[PDB]
Structures are given as structure tokens and as C-alpha cells.
From a paper:
MazEF is a TA system implicated in the formation of “persisters cells” of M. tb, which contain more than 10 such members. All the MazF toxins from the family are RNases, capable of cleaving various types of RNA including mRNA, tRNA, or rRNA. To better reflect the specificity of MazF-mt3 in M. tb, the so-called MORE RNA-seq was developed, which identified the cleavage sequence as U↓CCUU. Here we report crystal structures of MazF-mt3 in its apo form and in complex with the C-terminal half of MazE-mt3.
Through extensive trials, only the MazE-mt346−82 peptide produced suitable crystals for structure determination. The final model contained three toxin monomers (chains A, B, and C) and two antitoxin monomers (chains D and I) with a space group P3121. These molecules formed peculiar combinations: while the toxin dimer comprising chains A/B complexed with one of the antitoxins (chain I) in a stoichiometry of 2:1 (named “the complete complex” hereinafter), the remaining toxin (chain C) associated with the other antitoxin (chain D) in a stoichiometry of 1:1 (“the half complex”). The β1–β2 loops of the three toxin molecules were still disordered while chains I and D resolved residues Leu46-Thr77 and Thr47-Ala69 of the antitoxins, respectively. The binding of the peptide did not change the structure of the toxin dimer, which is common among the MazEF members. The peptide formed two short helices (α3-α4) situated across the deep crevice formed by the dimer, and the α4-helix was located in the proximity to the loops. The total buried surface is 2392.8 Å2 between the MazF-mt3 dimer and its contacting MazE-mt3 monomer. Taken together, most intermolecular contacts are from the α3-helix and the α3-α4 loop. In contrast, the last helix (α4, fragment Thr60-Trp82) or the second-to-last helix (α3, fragment Leu46-Gly59) of the antitoxin exhibited minimal inhibitory effects. It was the peptide corresponding to the last two helices (α3-α4, i.e., Leu46-Trp82) with a molar ratio of 1:4 (antitoxin/toxin) that reduced the cleavage of the enzyme by 15%. MazF-mt3 represents scenario 3, where the cross-subunit loops remain open upon the binding of MazE-mt3.
Numbering used by the authors:
A (entry chain C): 2 to 13, 24 to 114
B (entry chain A): 1 to 13, 23 to 114
C (entry chain B): 2 to 12, 20 to 114
D (entry chain I): 46 to 77
E (entry chain D): 47 to 69
Write the structure that this text describes.
Amino acid sequence: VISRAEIYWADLRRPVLVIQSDPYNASRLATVIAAVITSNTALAAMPGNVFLPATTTRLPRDSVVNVTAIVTLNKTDLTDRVGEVPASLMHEVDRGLRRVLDL
Amino acid sequence: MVISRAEIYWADLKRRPVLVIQSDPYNASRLATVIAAVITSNTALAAMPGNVFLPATTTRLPRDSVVNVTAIVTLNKTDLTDRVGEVPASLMHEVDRGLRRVLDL
Amino acid sequence: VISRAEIYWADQPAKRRPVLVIQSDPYNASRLATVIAAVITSNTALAAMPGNVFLPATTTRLPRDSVVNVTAIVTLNKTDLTDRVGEVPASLMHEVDRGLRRVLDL
Amino acid sequence: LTGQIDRALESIHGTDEAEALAVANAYRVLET
Amino acid sequence: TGQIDRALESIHGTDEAEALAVA
């Protein structure tokens, strides 16, 4: 059951952060929208992007949500649920998404 | 040296880095003190609401950094010696947001 | 439970001096061990410095008339604040907020 | 705000250099 | 859009994570 704010491993293996809303996630829609999570922390200088410490994500290394790299994946491509991003850090993610998407 | 805001200096607090948050008018003045936020290397502190992560590729610091907006110090202008680098205005806006958050401004 | 706008006495010997809590109440009511404050001086001439806020002794309950030095900000442990002097009125804390935003470029 | 602050402090156990060296430096300002 | 452009010069090399996005 894919839910928003959750981090999954995706078949190239790279991590993704679910940004699709839970109504569309709990539906029979075969796709889920996500932002690509990189391990190049230098991308935290990008205005919209959000840094994610490994102690927070349960990921191997420190992470950065690249809000300019957004993907639509099939729900079957998501296998390993790593963990969930706190609502305070997901608010920063939402700010970046609305910034880059003009919403 | 004319100390300016958004600049990172090494300061003896234990030499550790600090981020100047005092405004440039007060910096270019005869006031002997400058207010700054302590920069840590514990990147896990970037989860604290308001704190700002700083990649070393951006700060010119050795390791990745985190601005601890709950750790505010007042240093003498002479205590600031090593001008490491400057924080971009986009990341300083994140710092400004955090400071207003923790200080209710 | 330390709240904003409150005045506390803060610590070779010791040289205890008064401080005004400027850290926001959300951060104060949290498990954060530190609190941010502005140093309160008794040199009323420092009220001429831009941003500083004068505090009458009839308002603060302090011994002498006071001036909040918005250029002197310290981070103290929450345990170091024990003796609560008093609270600063909301009108003068607006002046403190005005001064703080000036020196911090906020 | 308070909830997330407490949660983050759970991961960062103990005290950090900044949360301490700031409490250290404070005495120098008040003395002058 | 200098703010975005400034950060791009900082990361001289592009991340392969963003490449997989196109894919």
C-alpha cells in the first residue's frame, strides 16, 4: 500500500519520495508520482530541493529531494519501503514542488 | 576585514565555524560585536525545524554543514579571522525563515 | 516552563545579569535544552543605540531602569534560568521585535 | 512545531557542539 | 533565475539520478 511521504526503492536501483496524493495512491491507478532522491548533497543548493539526513530517511547515505526531477512510475516498480519523511520536512518538500510547478 | 552577513568564519567558541547573521549596517559600524549562528557538522541536525543544511561544495568548508538556528552567539569582530566563504541568497532565505521561526519575528 | 517576553537572571565568580527571552514559545515548550535571549543592561545610554529598547524599572520589576541590547544575544541552557523577574508588555516587545529584525536583517 | 522538534531531538541524542559552545560563548559577552 | 543558475555552476557534474528521471 503506497502512501505519500514514503520513500521506496525503485527499479533503475534508486530511492524515490512519493508525492502523489493518497487518494490517487489508494486507487486502481497503475502509476504513482514521485520525486527522485539523490545522494549528491550538493543539490541541496538548488532552491526547491530539500535535504534529507540518513538518520531521518533510514537510507544508507544522506539524501536530497530533487523537486525538479519528478517521475511517474508503475506501482509494481516500488519494492522496498525504506521509511517516511516527517511532516515538517515534507512541508519543505511541498514548498519546493509548488515553487517549481507554480502552484 | 569588513565582515558581511551570510559569510562563514572560523571562530574560537574549540575553533568551530559560525555564520554571520548580524545585518551589514551594524557590521560596517563601530559596534565591536557581531551576532552569528553556530555551524555544526552533525548533518542529522538538519531535521530540526528551522535548521538549514549547507553542502561543503557551497560553503567551501571541509565537510557538509548545518546551520543551528537555536545556537546563536555574539562574538567580537576581532574573533572572526578565517573568512571561509559566503552562503548564497537562496540558502540564506532558508536561514532567514528559520531565524524568524525560532525568534517569533 | 520558560515563555517568551520573560526576564530571568542569568549566570570568574558569576556576574549575574538579566536577560529577556526572545526564543519563540514553540521552541521553548519543546525538549530543546537551549533558549535564546537578549542581554539586558543597566546602562540606559545604550538606549541611544538603534534597535535597543528602554525598560522602566516600574515595568520590569528590576532594580534600576534597563535597556534591552538587541546586539547582545546569547544562548543559555534552560536550567540556568530559575528566578523569573517578570514579563515585558506586548507593546514594548513589539519594539524589541522591531529592533531584533533590524540587527538580524529579518 | 513542538512535536517535530521533540522528534528530531530523539534522533540526535545528547548535546551537540553548537547547543553547547553557544552556551559557552555566552558568558564572554555578558562579562564585557 | 540566477539563483537556480548559481546552484547549477556549483554542481559542475550532473547527477545520474536526474537522468533516470527522463527514463
